[PDB]
Amino acid sequence: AIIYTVELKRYGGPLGITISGTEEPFDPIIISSLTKGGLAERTGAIHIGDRILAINSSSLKGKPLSEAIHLLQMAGETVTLKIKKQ
């Protein structure tokens, strides 16, 4: 299991990705796409298929997509993501 953490400085903009998931607690939250020319793509830090285990230190284990969204809405200039490779 390859797990790593990345800290992204978004320079006032979005991370440049879309995540997908359900409200079923243990379903995984996955990175589904990368915006062309966006931060995620330019850094090459995260990719499609990657599972998000935590955001800003708050675990998503057994948490619905709505929780991930709640956290993202409170993201500051720097966002930390714990990633699990598929």
Partner: peptide, 8 residues
Amino acid sequence: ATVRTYSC
């Protein structure tokens, strides 16, 4: 369950 997509 329903799968939703969120841009961020």
